[PDB]
Amino acid sequence: NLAPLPPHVPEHLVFDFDMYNPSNLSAGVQEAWAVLQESNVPDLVWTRCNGGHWIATRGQLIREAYEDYRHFSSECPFIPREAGEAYDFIPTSMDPPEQRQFRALANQVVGMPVVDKLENRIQELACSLIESLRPQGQCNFTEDYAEPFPIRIFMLLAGLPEEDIPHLKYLTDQMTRPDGSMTFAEAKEALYDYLIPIIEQRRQKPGTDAISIVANGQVNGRPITSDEAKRMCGLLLVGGLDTVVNFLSFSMEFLAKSPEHRQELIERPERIPAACEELLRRFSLVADGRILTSDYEFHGVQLKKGDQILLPQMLSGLDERENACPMHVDFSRQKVSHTTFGHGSHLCLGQHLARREIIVTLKEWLTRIPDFSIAPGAQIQHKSGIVSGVQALPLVWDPATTKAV
Ligand code: HEM
Ligand SMILES: CC1(C)[C@@H]2CC[C@@]1(C)C(=O)C2
């Protein structure tokens, strides 16, 4: 279902990409998006799918567009439009200077200082989960680790019951990788229904959990409102539940198929931080966008006020103009160029958290299970959307080649 081309769009700029169902998804999600950076594709295209919107395809344009809040507003950041209209998360549906204060708060809950505090539980949980898996010689990495690992840690942070997981997860998934089962609005309302009660409770009877801090926070000198907190927590939730989860699977899928990469990490462990970057570059997985606030000519293309543009965070690091041999994984690249965690004012707050989770996983996994692969005759399926994912990851290994710690 293609939407009739608006009059301001030149035909030569049309490239019908479907962010929710890219053509050669079989080849992998990143490769599927990379079609956009082939020679036959202009830097800025219009797709008729998902209601019609612009896509910027080069590191350079995405970076610029992200800097330019004046022109490119976070107000309606999701495609399609109905979803972007419904989106009211804080601080992401806010432009500076309004953004600034909410950002400072969210930072209190997720910043460096919190990561630093939780470091021992992160390490504790990863070790616990790996050790538990080790002797089985087989898991479902997505369900067995990638999910519980980050999730349980967020739940700890949030002070929410692990009992809620399955439910929260269904709803978050509905937002990034729509099923068809529920609209964005519908999904958002249900998450909101979950949070309302809890927020009220923590406004009265505060604790030390992230939710308690957000609920009782100060913004622009005054007390945050109930609605505002509901809206920030909505963000925290999506962030805790939906990002690190998918990334881990992509990384692990890769590590499963590259003996030589695993080995490099085992002998020269001082390279783990470098490799984490490179993996973040190569298995980049978020794509959102901005809304034109007014008519604006950008790189010779005339954008009209109200036009939505997708600026794929995933795409920067994959652009050959940014990194030579972009689909190649090189842990010793002199310069790892990406915008996996965004660019401009909205730069991911949770990045420190994400980095710790990844790095721990890599060291702790390789220590114990150095040798593993994908279960024979497994068809590994990726999924596209706001946050791309791996459907399942069947891994197999010889218990005898493992190391108990
Ligand atoms: C691999 C993991 C992650 C990736 C790829 C990622 C990606 C993103 C991106 C692309 C944005 C900016 C979106 C925009 O400019 O429209 C962002 C913002 C944000 N992220 Fe993440 N994120 C990650 C992990 C997390 C985690 C675990 C948390 C929660 C602890 C989180 C919390 C946030 C928040 C609060 C913001 C909004 C900052 C603001 O609007 O100023 N992130 N993230
Ligand atoms: C694009 C994002 C990664 C950022 C945090 C969660 C997310 C899905 C949004 O709605 C804003």
Side-chain angles (χ1 to χ4, degrees):
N1 179 292
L2 273 44
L5 189 70
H8 68 300
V9 179
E11 283 163 288
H12 67 272
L13 293 186
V14 180
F15 195 78
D16 300 311
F17 195 82
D18 183 349
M19 67 170 286
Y20 295 102
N21 190 259
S23 278
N24 195 67
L25 186 62
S26 306
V29 91
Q30 297 71 203
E31 299 81 350
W33 277 74
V35 299
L36 289 167
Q37 296 169 138
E38 296 288 349
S39 63
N40 65 121
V41 194
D43 292 5
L44 183 56
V45 298
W46 174 266
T47 166
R48 286 180 296 183
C49 341
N50 304 120
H53 54 93
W54 295 105
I55 313 185
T57 72
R58 300 295 175 167
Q60 182 187 222
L61 293 60
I62 286 154
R63 285 207 171 68
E64 277 174 6
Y66 279 133
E67 299 191 20
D68 194 9
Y69 66 84
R70 219 85 62 68
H71 301 100
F72 298 104
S73 178
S74 270
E75 177 202 279
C76 190
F78 280 25
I79 275 152
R81 189 178 295 281
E82 318 70 80
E85 288 191 339
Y87 188 98
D88 60 4
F89 306 129
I90 306 180
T92 61
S93 61
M94 292 178 185
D95 286 314
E98 179 168 54
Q99 179 248 172
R100 168 203 166 63
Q101 281 268 7
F102 301 78
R103 172 181 179 74
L105 180 59
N107 188 54
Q108 288 194 38
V109 308
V110 303
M112 288 177 68
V114 168
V115 178
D116 277 352
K117 186 205 70 137
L118 285 187
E119 228 220 302
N120 297 148
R121 305 307 296 279
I122 293 179
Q123 170 81 15
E124 172 187 36
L125 175 56
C127 295
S128 173
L129 229 42
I130 301 168
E131 181 48 40
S132 168
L133 298 173
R134 200 189 53 80
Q136 288 174 19
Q138 92 198 101
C139 69
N140 183 207
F141 189 84
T142 67
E143 72 186 306
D144 300 337
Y145 185 91
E147 285 168 23
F149 175 57
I151 298 176
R152 287 187 220 179
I153 284 153
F154 174 82
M155 305 297 255
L156 173 82
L157 184 74
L160 289 173
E162 293 184 4
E163 307 79 89
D164 296 333
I165 286 161
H167 171 66
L168 289 177
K169 185 63 187 167
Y170 177 76
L171 306 165
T172 305
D173 288 356
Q174 298 295 237
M175 300 177 199
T176 52
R177 293 182 298 298
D179 203 326
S181 46
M182 82 191 288
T183 76
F184 179 89
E186 214 94 317
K188 190 194 79 174
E189 295 304 324
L191 175 70
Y192 292 158
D193 278 4
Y194 175 83
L195 298 173
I196 295 166
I198 297 177
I199 279 165
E200 291 194 7
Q201 213 166 100
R202 276 73 155 174
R203 320 199 72 176
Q204 300 177 289
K205 301 161 166 55
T208 52
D209 63 288
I211 301 184
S212 283
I213 313 292
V214 175
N216 300 127
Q218 290 285 82
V219 298
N220 190 250
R222 55 77 184 177
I224 185 165
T225 70
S226 191
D227 169 64
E228 285 170 345
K230 184 195 66 178
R231 299 193 302 155
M232 289 204 224
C233 290
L235 191 70
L236 296 193
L237 255 290
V238 178
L241 278 60
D242 209 54
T243 53
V244 183
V245 174
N246 298 295
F247 184 68
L248 286 178
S249 303
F250 292 114
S251 289
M252 199 97 321
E253 181 190 7
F254 177 66
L255 283 183
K257 315 165 203 272
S258 203
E260 315 79 18
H261 286 88
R262 298 198 288 271
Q263 257 306 112
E264 209 179 326
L265 305 173
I266 296 158
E267 26 200 341
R268 306 250 62 94
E270 63 292 350
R271 286 193 175 155
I272 295 178
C276 180
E277 277 326 279
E278 174 62 359
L279 293 156
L280 282 160
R281 182 186 68 77
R282 176 70 183 63
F283 299 106
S284 201
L285 80 153
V286 171
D288 77 343
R290 297 297 184 259
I291 188 165
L292 277 285
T293 60
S294 75
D295 293 6
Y296 180 57
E297 193 194 43
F298 176 70
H299 297 278
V301 193
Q302 248 289 347
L303 309 177
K304 285 207 176 166
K305 185 191 175 173
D307 284 352
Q308 281 188 291
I309 180 185
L310 185 62
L311 300 166
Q313 289 92 336
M314 182 192 308
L315 290 187
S316 300
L318 304 184
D319 192 341
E320 50 287 29
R321 314 179 182 182
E322 306 282 311
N323 302 283
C325 299
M327 309 303 277
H328 177 61
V329 177
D330 182 4
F331 302 159
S332 66
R333 292 187 173 276
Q334 292 302 148
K335 191 45 151 281
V336 177
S337 174
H338 65 78
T339 70
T340 282
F341 297 109
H343 195 63
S345 64
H346 293 270
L347 190 50
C348 190
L349 291 166
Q351 69 189 98
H352 306 295
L353 183 61
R355 287 192 181 70
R356 206 64 224 146
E357 297 191 351
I358 295 153
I359 289 185
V360 174
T361 294
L362 300 180
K363 189 199 164 288
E364 298 319 328
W365 189 284
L366 304 160
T367 295
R368 305 167 187 53
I369 318 175
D371 221 69
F372 65 102
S373 50
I374 296 173
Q379 277 247 357
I380 304 298
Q381 289 161 261
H382 303 160
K383 279 281 299 180
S384 202
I386 306 290
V387 190
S388 295
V390 170
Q391 196 149 103
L393 183 64
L395 305 186
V396 292
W397 61 95
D398 184 348
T401 72
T402 68
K403 294 202 214 171
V405 162

